[PDB]
Amino acid sequence: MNIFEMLRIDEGLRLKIYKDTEGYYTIGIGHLLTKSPSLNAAKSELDKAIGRNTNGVITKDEAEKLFNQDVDAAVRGILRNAKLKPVYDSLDAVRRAALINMVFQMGETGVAGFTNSLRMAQQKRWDEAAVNLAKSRWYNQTPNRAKRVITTFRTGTWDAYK
Ligand SMILES: [Cl-]
Ligand SMILES: [Cl-]
Ligand SMILES: [Xe]
């Protein structure tokens, strides 16, 4: 298992514009296109992202291309974030993937605000962190996903993904 396979599981793959859980126009493997309710806007963002007139439809490769770019951006966001970096660098490989997953989902910003959990994580207080993490809108809005990520963070293994 790895970060790619893990998020491919959490996000799925859709070759046509769709609305995510928040109602936002998305494509491929969780690639957000726009927060705007305009489908045309969304289609405009897609064409821009791909470099062609997609008509709101892309290939599997196209989708995996966007995915890679997105996973890369998520880690670089973490490494550039003053609050995130030190946590990340303190973690083992599996727990680092859990962190990247959250940032992919919620953005740098979103995650940099989990101050309390971030601290417990740095102290290696797995259980407490896990509990603090579940006290969030994130857990209450996508609980099965949140559970998987949290268990990963808590244990350091991929069992939630078997
Ligand atoms: Cl893009
Ligand atoms: Cl979920
Ligand atoms: Xe965290």
Side-chain angles (χ1 to χ4, degrees):
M1 176 79 38
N2 61 51
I3 191 57
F4 285 92
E5 295 172 356
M6 189 197 202
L7 278 160
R8 161 90 164 63
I9 279 161
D10 282 341
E11 300 290 348
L13 176 47
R14 285 179 83 198
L15 298 189
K16 58 278 208 128
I17 297 187
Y18 65 97
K19 295 196 184 172
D20 77 2
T21 55
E22 311 292 338
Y24 305 134
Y25 278 135
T26 304
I27 208 172
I29 306 172
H31 180 82
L32 175 71
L33 294 161
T34 192
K35 302 231 222 88
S36 129
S38 170
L39 185 67
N40 306 289
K43 284 156 145 229
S44 175
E45 294 287 317
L46 190 55
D47 294 340
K48 193 164 45 92
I50 305 293
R52 70 201 186 45
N53 275 201
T54 66
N55 177 44
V57 177
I58 66 182
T59 71
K60 181 177 200 137
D61 328 276
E62 279 171 342
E64 280 158 2
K65 195 186 189 157
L66 294 182
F67 186 42
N68 279 338
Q69 288 168 176
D70 292 343
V71 172
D72 197 356
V75 18
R76 356 226 351 214
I78 278 173
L79 301 171
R80 299 234 192 91
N81 192 291
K83 255 132 204 45
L84 298 172
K85 188 181 144 91
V87 174
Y88 182 93
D89 274 349
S90 67
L91 305 171
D92 52 278
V94 179
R95 298 183 169 91
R96 279 168 190 190
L99 192 65
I100 292 168
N101 191 304
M102 301 175 67
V103 165
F104 178 102
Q105 190 189 350
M106 62 211 147
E108 123 182 51
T109 359
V111 185
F114 283 65
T115 288
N116 295 301
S117 295
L118 291 169
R119 173 211 174 241
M120 286 164 209
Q122 202 165 332
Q123 296 157 144
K124 313 231 176 262
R125 308 159 145 242
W126 311 130
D127 274 62
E128 319 176 34
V131 168
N132 185 272
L133 277 170
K135 298 192 226 145
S136 58
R137 165 179 217 260
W138 172 51
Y139 177 84
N140 289 102
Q141 302 295 142
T142 45
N144 298 327
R145 187 199 178 139
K147 282 182 238 266
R148 280 200 288 281
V149 174
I150 293 181
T151 281
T152 296
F153 236 125
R154 199 174 34 93
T155 60
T157 70
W158 298 113
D159 298 337
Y161 290 82
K162 282 74 122 123

